[PDB]
């Protein structure tokens with residue numbers, strides 16, 4: 001039994017099937033009242049909602065599904081004929097995410113790809129019939145935001161207008177990625193400030209006694 005399974009169980013026992021809103025609220029409740037977990041959450045969720053509503057992307061790529069929260073969040077807004085592709089490195093999480101989408105009734109809009117971003121991204125054109133992406137949501141390993149962004153470019157998957165939306169760029173932080181897209185005149189950058197809440201998690205003090213110079 002894992003934390004991720006417990007999240008899914010809580011949803012299955014408390015949310016109304018076919019109701020994505022209901023699913024989102026159950027995950028947000030669990031991860032902030034019952035047991036802390038990595039979770040985009042409703043505050044940042046509203047920023048995502050506004051971005052999707054503004055740009056109405058049709059083909060969306062998500063890096064890092066975890067338990068499906070972001071997938072449910074985005075896919076519930078996607079229009080008929082839209083496709084969300086989600087890459088998830090961990091088979092257990094990929095399975096959790098599939099169940100999350102089934103329960104929300106959003107599974108027809110999403111294709112979960114199980115594997116590493118740098119192995120999958122070069123396959124998107126040939127194997128998944130992708131010309132260019134409308135939107136990319138980055139939420140996977142923080143040190144892979146910059147190299148995957150460059151890999152997307154090299155593969156020809158970005159067009160003028162493609163929206164990159166990156167989470168957790170402050171905490172834990174992705175300073176190389178932020179410096180690149182802000183520095184490069186090929187990206188127009190807006191930063192939406194929000195919060196990350198921790199609750200009932202393991203922390204600690206370090207005691208360090210100076211021994212003198214050496």
Ligand SMILES: Cc1nc(C)c(-c2cc([C@H](C)c3ccccc3)n[nH]2)s1
Pocket residue numbers: 063064065066087088089090115116117118139140141142144
């Ligand atoms: C090279 C990589 N390709 C993918 C698709 C990765 C990936 C990361 C995650 C989860 C969300 C995560 C996010 C942050 C820290 C730990 C775990 N899922 N999938 S890594």
Ligand SMILES: [K+]
Pocket residue numbers: 181182183184185186187188189
């Ligand atoms: K820039």
Ligand SMILES: [K+]
Pocket residue numbers: 193
């Ligand atoms: K503030």
